[model samples]
Target: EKRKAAAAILSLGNVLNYLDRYTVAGVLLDIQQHFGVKDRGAGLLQSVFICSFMVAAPIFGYLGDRFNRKVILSCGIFFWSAVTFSSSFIPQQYFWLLVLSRGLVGIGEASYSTIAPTIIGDLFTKNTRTLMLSVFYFAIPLGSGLGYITGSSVKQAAGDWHWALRVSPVLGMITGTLILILVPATKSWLRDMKALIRNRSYVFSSLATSAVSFATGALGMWIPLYLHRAQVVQKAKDSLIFGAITCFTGFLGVVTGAGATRWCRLKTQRADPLVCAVGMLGSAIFICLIFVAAKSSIVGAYICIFVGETLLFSNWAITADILMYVVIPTRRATAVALQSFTSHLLGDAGSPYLIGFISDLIRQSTKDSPLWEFLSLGYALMLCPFVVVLGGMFFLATALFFVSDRARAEQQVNQ
Candidate 1:
C-alpha cells in the first residue's frame, strides 16, 4: 500500500514537473510578441532552461547519492514553484529575469527528475519496475498536454500570459508536501561515479537517450508554433491540438511499449534495449511522414503526429529500466544523473537553439515569399527525423551489449 501511495505521489510530482515546464511552450508566441523577438530568440528561452537542467542534474545527482533524496526533492519543488509564480509578475521589460527564473526551474526539476525513477527501481523487481515506471512516466505527455491547454486557456480567459504561470506553484507546493510525508528516505550509495562510467551499456544508452532528446525537444518547442503558423489550427488554439495529440498518443504508446517489454522479459534479457531500438527507428519513420503529411492533408498530419509521437514515447519506461537493471542499486541515482546530464547537454539543451537558428537562416533565404515564414519552420523541423534515426542506431548498438552488460553488473552486485 505504501509503495502504491508513494508511486502515486511521485507520479503527481512528475506530472506537475512537466506541466510547469511545458507551460511556456503554449505561450511562446505571446512571449515572442511581447518581447519582440524572432524564432531563434524564443527558442533560446527553452534552451536556457534545458541548459540549466543539464548543468544542475549532475550536482543534484551527486547530492542525491549521498543525502536524503526526499529533502532535496522537496527543496527543488518549492524553489521552482516560487520562481514560476514570481515569473508571472515580471514585466516584459524585465524578461531576462523571467529567463533566469526558467533556468532556476530547471534546477528544481533536476532534483526530482534525477532521483524519481531510481526510487521506483528501489521498490520493484525488474518486470514490475518497467510497469511502475510506465505509470510514473505517463505523466510526461499527459502533464505536458495539460500545460499546453492550461497555458492557452488561461491566456484566453485571463487576457495575459503570466496568469498561466500561477498554476504550477500551488500544485508544486502541494505535491512537495505530500512527497515529504509519504515517500521514505533512501540512503546515499557507496559506489563512485567511475563505476557507472565503466559500464558500456550505460554509456551507449546515454548517447541514444541524448539523440532522442534532440528530436523530441525540438519538436515539443516548435510544433505548437508550427501548427499555428501553418493555419492548421487557429493561432491561439494550436496548443490544444498539439497537446491533445501528444497526450493521447504518448499515453497509449508508453503503456503498450511497457506491456510488450514486460512480456518479452520472460523470453530474453535483450527485450528492453531491443524494444528501445525499434521504438526509435519506428519514430524516425513516422516523424518523416509527419512532415510530408503536413503539406498534403490536415487529417493526415494529425494521424502521423499521433503515430509518430506514440512510437517516439513508447520507449520511456523501457529505456529507464535499462539503466536501472543494468547498473547496481548503489549507483542508480548517479547513473540517472549521468544520463540526464549527457542527454540534455548534448541533445535538447542545444537542439531548440540549433533548430531555431537553422529556421532563421532558412527564413532569410525564403524571404522572397510571405508564406516562407511558415515554411521555414517545416524545413527546419526536418532535422528531427534525421537525428532520431541516428539515435536508433545507437540504441541498436546498445542492444548488442545489453545482455552481457546486465549480467556483468549483476555479477558485480553479487560479489
Candidate 2:
C-alpha cells in the first residue's frame, strides 16, 4: 500500500513538473505579443529552460545517488513552485526575467526527473517496474497536454496570461509536501560514468532518446502556433484541442508500448529495442504526412498528427525499462541523469531554437507574408522526421548489444 501510494505521489509530481513547464507554451502567442518578440525569441524561452535543465540533471543525478532524495526532491519542488509563481509577475518590459525564471524552473524539474524514476526502479522489478515507470512517464505528455489546456483555459477565464503560470504552483506545493511525507529514498560517480559511456546499449539508447526529445520539444513548442498561423484553427482553441489529443495519444502510446514489449519479450530478448525502433520508424512516416496534409486538409493533418504522436510517444516507458535491465541499482541514477543530460543537450535543448533559426533564415530569403511564414516553419519541422529515422537506426544498434549488456548488469548486481 505504501509503495503504491509513493508511486502515485511521484507520478503526480511528474505530472505537475511538465504542466508547469509547458504552460508557457500554451500562452505563447500572448507572451509574444506582449514582449513583441519574433519566433526566434519565442523559441528562446523553451531553449533557455532546456539548457538549464540539462546542465542541472547531472548534478542532481550525482546528489540523488549520495544524499536523501526525498528532502532534495521536496526542496526542488518548493523552489520550482516559488519561482513559477514569482515569474508570473514579471513586468512586460522584463521578458528576460521571465526567461530566467523558466531556467530556475528547469533546475527544480531536474531534481525530480532524475531522481523519481530511480526510486520507482527500486520499488518494482521486471514487468511491474515497467508498468510503474509507464504510469510515471505517461505523465510527461499528460501534464504537457494539461499545461496547454490549463494555461489557455485559465488565461481565458482570468483574462490574463499570467494566471496560466499560477495554477501549477498550487498543485506543485501540495505534491511537494506529499512527496516529503510519503516517499521512500534509497541510496554513485566518475568511474560509473566511464562504465556508462562504455556500455553500447546505454549510449545508443541515450542517443535514440535524444532524437525523440528533439522532435517532441520542437513540435510541442511550435505545432499549435503552426496550425494557427496556417489559418486552420484559432490559437487558443487549437492549444486546447492539441492538448486533448496529446493526453489521449500519450496514454494510448505508453500502454501500447508496454503491452507490446511484454508480449514480444516472450519471443525475443531484443524486444525492447526492436519495439522502439519499429515505433520510431513508423512514426516518422506519419509525421511527414502531417506537413503534406496541412496545406489542404485540416482533418487529414490532424489524423496524421494523431498517428505520428502516438507512435512517437510509445517508446518513453520502454526506454526507461531498458536502462533498468542494463544498469545496476547503484549506478542507475547516474545513468538516468547522463541519459537525461545527453537527450536534452543534443535534443530539445537546441532543437526548438535551431528550428526557429532555420525558419527565420528561410523567411529572410522571401518577402514576409503569411504563406511564407507557414511554409518556412513547415520546412523547418521537416527536419524532425529525418532525425527520428536516425533514432530508429540507433535503437536497431542497441538491439545488437542488449543481451550482453543485460547479462553484464545482472552479473554486477549479483556480485
Candidate 3:
C-alpha cells in the first residue's frame, strides 16, 4: 500500500509538473494580447524557462543522487508551487517578473523530473518497469491537455490569464504534501559523470530523446496558436478540441506502445529502442502530412494531428526504460539528470523560440496580410518533421548498440 501510494503521488507530481508548465501554451495568444508582445518575445518566456531547466537539471539531479531524494522531491514541489502561486499577484507592467517566476519553476521541476522517475525505477524491475514508466509518463500529454483546458476555460470565464495561472499551484501543493506524508526516502550512491558520458548507447539515446523533446516542445507551444490563427475554430473551442484529442490519443498511444514493447522484448533484446525508433519515424511522417492537409480539410488535418500525436508519445516510456536498463543502477539518477540537461539544451530549450522566431520572420514577409500570416505559420511548422526525422534515425542507431550496452551493465551488476 505504501509503495502504491508513493507511485500514485509521484505520478500526480508528474501530472502537475506538466500541467503548470503547459497552461501557458493554451493561453499564449491571450498573454500576447495582454502584454502587447510579438510571438517571439512571448516565446522567449518559455525559452528562458527551459534554459533554466537545462542549467539546473544537472545540479538538482546531482543532489538527488547524493541526498534523500524524497526531501529533494518535496522541496522541489513546494518551490515550484510557491512560485506559480506568487505569479498571480504580479502586475502587468512588470512582465519580466512573470518570466522570472517561470524560470524558477524550472528549478523546482528540475529537481522533481530528475528524481521522480528514479524513484519509479527503484520500485520496479525490467519487465514491470516499462509498464510503470508508461503509467508515469502518461501524465505528459494528459497534463498538457488539462493545462490547455484549465488555462483556456479559466481565462474565458474569469476574463484574465492570472486566474488561469493560479490553478496548478494548489494542485502542486496538495501533491507535495501527500508525497511527504506517504513516499519513503531514498539513498543511492552516486557515480562519476565521466562514466555516464562514456557509455555509447546512453549518449545516442539521449540525443534521440532530445530530438523528440524539441518537436514536442515546439508543437505544444504553437499548435493551439496555429489552430486559432488558422481560423479553424474560435478561440473558445479550438483549445478544447485540441486538448481533448491530445488526451485521448496520448492515453491510447502510450498504453499501446507499452504493451507492444513488452511483447517485443520477449522476442528481442533491442526491443525498447527499436520501438522508440519506429514510433518516432512514424510520428515524423504523420506530422509532415499535417502541414499538407492543414489548408485543404480541417477534418483531415485533425486526423493527422491525432495520428502524429499518438506516434510521437509512443516513445516516452520505451526511451526511459532503455536508459534505465542500460545504465548501472547507482548512476541512473545522474544519467537521468544528464539526459534532462542535454535533451532540454538541444531540444525544447530553443525549439519554441526558434519556431516562433521563424514564424515571426515569415509573418514579416506577409506584410500585414492576414492570409499570408496563416500560411507563414504553416510553413514554419514544417520544421518540426525534419527535426523529428533526425531524432528517429538516432533511435534506430541506438537499437543497434542497445543489446551490447545492456550486456555490459548486466556484467557490472554481476561483478
For candidate 2, write residues 1-415 as lDDT tens digits: 6788899899989988888888889898888878887788877899999999889887887798687788998999999999999898888788888889989998988888877888987888789888998788776778979988998899999999889988778888899888888887655379999989988999999999999999999999988888877763322687888899998998888878888898999999889899999999889999999988988877787889989998998985589889989988989867887888789889999998998898999999999888888899899999999999999999999999999999998998999
| Candidates sorted on TM-score, descending | 2, 3, 1
Error of 1 at 104 (Å): 1.3
Clashes of each: 0, 0, 0
How good is model 2 by TM-score? 0.88
Give the C-alpha lDDT of model 3: 0.83
Number of the predicted model whose TM-score against the real structure is largest: 2
Residues 164-250 of candidate 3 have per-residue lDDT tens digits of: 888778888889999989987755333457887788898999999899899999988888888777774222677877888888988
Residue-level lDDT for 222 in candidate 2: 88
Cα lDDT of all candidates, in order? 0.82, 0.87, 0.83
* Candidate 3: regions farther than 4 A off: 1-6, 65-72, 116-135, 177-197, 232-235, 262-272, 328-330, 406-415
- Candidate 1 lDDT over 22-90, as tens digits, reads 998888888887877778886788999999988887787678778777788889888899889988787
List the candidate 1 regions with Cα displacement exceeding 4 Å.
1-7, 65-72, 115-135, 176-199, 232-235, 262-271, 328-331, 368-370, 410-415
lDDT of 1 at 330: 76
Worst 10 residues of 1 by lDDT: 227-236
Model 3 pairs whose backbones collide: none
Q: How many residue pairs in model 3 have overlapping backbones? A: 0
